[PDB]
Amino acid sequence: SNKKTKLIHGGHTTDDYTGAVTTPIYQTSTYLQDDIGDLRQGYEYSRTANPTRSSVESVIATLENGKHGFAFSSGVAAISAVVMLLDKGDHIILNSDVYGGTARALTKVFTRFGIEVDFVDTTHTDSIVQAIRPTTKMLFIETPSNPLLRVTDIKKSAEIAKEHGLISVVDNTFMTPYYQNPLDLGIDIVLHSATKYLGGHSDVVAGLVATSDDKLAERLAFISNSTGGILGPQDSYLLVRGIKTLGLRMEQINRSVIEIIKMLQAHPAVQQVFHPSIESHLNHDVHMAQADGHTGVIAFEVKNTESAKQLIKATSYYTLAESLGAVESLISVPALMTHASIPADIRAKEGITDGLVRISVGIEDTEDLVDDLKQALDTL
Amino acid sequence: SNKKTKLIHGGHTTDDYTGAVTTPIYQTSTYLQDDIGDLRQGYEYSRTANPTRSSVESVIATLENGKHGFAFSSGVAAISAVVMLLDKGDHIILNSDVYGGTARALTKVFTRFGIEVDFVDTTHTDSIVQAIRPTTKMLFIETPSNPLLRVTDIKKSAEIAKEHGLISVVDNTFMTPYYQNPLDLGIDIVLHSATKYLGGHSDVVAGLVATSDDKLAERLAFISNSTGGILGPQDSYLLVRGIKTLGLRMEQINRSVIEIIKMLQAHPAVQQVFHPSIESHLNHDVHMAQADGHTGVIAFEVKNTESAKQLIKATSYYTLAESLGAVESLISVPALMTHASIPADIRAKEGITDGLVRISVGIEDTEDLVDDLKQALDTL
Amino acid sequence: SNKKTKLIHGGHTTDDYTGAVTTPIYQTSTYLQDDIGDLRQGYEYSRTANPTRSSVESVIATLENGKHGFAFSSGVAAISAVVMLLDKGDHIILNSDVYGGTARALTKVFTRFGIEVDFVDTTHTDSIVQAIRPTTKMLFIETPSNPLLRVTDIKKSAEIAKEHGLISVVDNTFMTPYYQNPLDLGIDIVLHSATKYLGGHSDVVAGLVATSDDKLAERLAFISNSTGGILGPQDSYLLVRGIKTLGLRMEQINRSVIEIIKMLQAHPAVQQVFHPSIESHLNHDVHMAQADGHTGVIAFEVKNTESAKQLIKATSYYTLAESLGAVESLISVPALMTHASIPADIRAKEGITDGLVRISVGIEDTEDLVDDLKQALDTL
């Protein structure tokens, strides 16, 4: 019925054979055949299918109201699988500030295979309509984006994509299936870095893909079986286990996000704050129309580089590390850690100022996270 | 010094920190930074590098006398990584009977990205010289091949490749590093389905790549980090553990192979036998010059389909399943299980007769495997 | 600072060496010594100590405000370890309705070693004072108990134990460290079946023990090293990971418990309800004085056996299985599943009527659990 219930009882995460209430870990590569071609339960070679991976795939399919799930060895492997639906000469539109790893994959790997890529500001959907070429076959959207959390209208992107015969894809990592279901809004394919919120415990690198399209599912399965970026059984198990608490975690993260944003907007040592919950944020109405909660990623400006470094070292409960979506709260400085190769004045142009801090809110006590960040800001 | 010693003491498979005599399993995605950019031991994000994966990579690099190792989520992911060294318009030569999954990847995935592929009979190396085009950039060789175990001269293929500016690649799965070291013979890149002999226990799907070329290594690392077909830490650990016994396993397998081949050549219900140890086999001299042992895969002809099915069901110690390189002995019928989509008369043309049986010799008692197969053959 | 924060940042659950933000899994048995007696980081043999087990032990010690943690292969192994602090001729007081496995261990195993055991109603602490013999050395208390949730005054039990020179022990499984800290109230030793709430995901059988007493800790360590009921590294890792969400899980469980109890008290097909939150419950004041939340175990009477079976099969979100403390809600009938060997009229005497149902509330949506149970009750 309701979401927290569905997280527990949706999908196939028990053992039909023994009744084990958790998915068995099939640390195995091949399977007995009773006769040539007779598969006991459909399995014959773990790259093609493995029952633990199948359990996690059924989970992501159920949670996104899709029909088919796919588990890859990482988020970028999921993305490469999806991009491989295209041929040389095909063209793909991506939102202009898409994830750095996504941009790198497209422009430094797939353009060598004749995939053409255009980055557009999808915050106005007519931008998409202008960028459509006769060779465009895919529209690829993150919402909200990193690290400034730009929101893209998912439903309109889906309509545009259908009208022009495009495969629509949403990287739903930041929102998770708990808050935003792109397939329900007409999108062809939804994907996730399960490395982040879904696994939720910073201990699995994994990607997940869901679709309701039988033909797209068949092509994805062919690509996964032929290029082989499959998730292993132990990581699939840890993913299923982590997803059990997704709702509780995201709701705690959201309570802290609201309180932390109040604090940041009030504080003198903080200028601009980037988050879709702020009513002045571009397309705040749109986000509210397509999601019923918020991501735990916030960005905000302090004065300069050394204020940011001071902030990092003054906090007791914000940890300096890569990734987002941990049980710990994480802090980072994009201009030094993710956008450092970009020349400084294009960084400034894009809003990636030297004092832009990104935090990924964890599940610590709300008041502790507010107080710790505020006392650290008070030293600036 | 000697090979069985090197299998135990070569590579980094202990913990410098605690002294643990086995590699710790780093079931983790990200890493604390003491300062922005200060990595404690070089780690920052598990897709880029993970210390358990690093342990297995150092093992494959050491065992092939290379400098750089790479661990992928499967053999075909290793192969796709290597093929992605090429650009649209580039051309690759493969041996004509290359692994079905390899052929499928190249002709149904990578040709859509403008990679051109030509299959040649590399058992005569001048075939390679004839097939070279101005656009050829890669030469890809399995030796010996599946399921008829054709041998290709590795050293001459390396010389040819160097003279024409080609990246040379050997799929060394069937021989393993214990018996055949392509990098020692001038090959640029060696790869493995570690799913088979290296893991050795039918419980990991994985690929491994080694090279001595710094620039090729840098490009492989970039491709692995951007397309993300990485092996997880638990599977890397199981790989290291399985490789410990590789020498003992391969030597037992070889003792049984010699005895089983004597039996098969003597038996009336058996026609042709395919294995590089037979002195009448094409390029037997070449194989002996480039390897100091044998693969555990044998193929042999019985009369027809139902003799093969009878054989399978009469044996007590040969198991009907996909894959090769298990501790169990495995039996299969290519014409029904791996070449069934090919029309019957091209199957016959290629030697894939309806009675061609393939066995992958395991580590059971030699006399038991000889006796069990012979008594099963005696029922034909 | 606050509890949800302490769950994330308390204890040692990162890797000092690589910075890995999760505890490495040391799947290892022994450790290199640089010189005879020189242990690099204190490890020499995994039974004596293993760094993953050490991580989980530091977690349980921190969460109970103790000094020493111990991880055993199960709850009953923790209990046997603690009972082995005694010698033949020593006497132990346990609360009269203690866990069936505990009772069985004491009366069918340890009495054969000359341990004498007396069961008393500890809901009145003067019962303890009456039962003290000159040979009594241990007082062992669960609060609240299974399946009728009797509450025992922990602080008074501690005072009594200190005055008469007894080792006081509390089985704190049902409350978890999130809600009840016996060591803070003077108890010598606190233990847990981490199989239940702490692991929280029905995928680890494990026990945990914490103490602040150096001498008791030394004796426990000696017993653990000599009788060897240690938890393995993979299970220790899964325990640490599960404990991360303990607070969020228990708080969701508590919201549903309050609402479900309102429903049960209102429903006509339900007679008595057993839970310490009910103000009419014996020692409700005491529980509130020693805990700041509630267990997720509830018991309640329906009419008879077949009403209970009907109830079980009418619910969609209550699962029929052993154990408690899962993410799923669990349902059971003690008179058939845990007290079936007791004659029927002593069952009735004790309150274990044929219609007594026990539910362990999970983390599903509150309204779904209320509605599902109520609609199932409405069919009676």
Place this chain on the structure above:
Amino acid sequence: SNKKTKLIHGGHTTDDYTGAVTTPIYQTSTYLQDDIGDLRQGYEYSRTANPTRSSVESVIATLENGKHGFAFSSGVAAISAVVMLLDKGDHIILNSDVYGGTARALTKVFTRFGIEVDFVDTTHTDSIVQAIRPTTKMLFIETPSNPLLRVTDIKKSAEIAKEHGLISVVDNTFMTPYYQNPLDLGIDIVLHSATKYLGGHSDVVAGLVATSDDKLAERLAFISNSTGGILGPQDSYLLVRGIKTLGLRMEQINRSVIEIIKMLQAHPAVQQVFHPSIESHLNHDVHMAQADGHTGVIAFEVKNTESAKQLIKATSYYTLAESLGAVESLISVPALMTHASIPADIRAKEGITDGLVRISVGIEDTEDLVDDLKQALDTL
């Protein structure tokens, strides 16, 4: 049929449900019941039984020609389980130089429960007959023993035990089921530290017990379920996997043992050598009559402490660590590492001289182990 075959095909180590050729890892604690009391495949709570543990138990039972297997969290937990077959006032005979952990368990833990223990020189079996008291109920034998490898006649010990109504137990760790089967010679119970050869890779701490006695099996199962020293599923899986190569490993170890002993007997810097293969060894005939191979543990005298330390640091392929039975060769000095608490002159009395070195032969190349040890000895 033959032993290497039985290691691969004996026991239940595949999945009946999916056909998976390796045992699934049931990382689970409890199991769905279709009706109260209806267990789908006999499982209801993982402490009582877990299907991965059941797989390893069936393996040890098959390999020792027993009927019932039991897997414990360590060797000493197996031993404590077996000792708990006794009651206060019962008396147990152990061989005089039994494992230090065994001696410590008996004399410092179980004597506090009224178990009486007598150490006798079982190398003459009439010693056993002299030590029998009216209260003796158990006879516990290691053969060969640590670190001087004394041999005890197993068959005569069994006859003696049966005639006087004693439960006979053999710690068969050093020989493994591959070479010595005590149950075949009349022994009631056989046990193993699977931490050593059976797991074989220094990455599992575990114990295994096998018996053919239904009543003893029922009592062991009751003790295991009530005191809870169970092996977890991941460790059970790693045990099954390690046992696959037991025969190949032990045979390599034995080839190196023979050659190393020739070297040691010839070398001037080496005095006495302790190993049952030497024809001058006490009860060499007896060992040959009850085993068809040898343990990989050897002890030998060098001059003094600093010759032993020099030896350790001169070898390249002998590793300084606790335990025995690794793939690596291990070296140790009992007088400093296992017998250091014993006063020096009783050490000398027992033969534990300051220059007594113990090596556990691994699976490195034979000639490398001979040459490395000899060149290290040549520096003395």
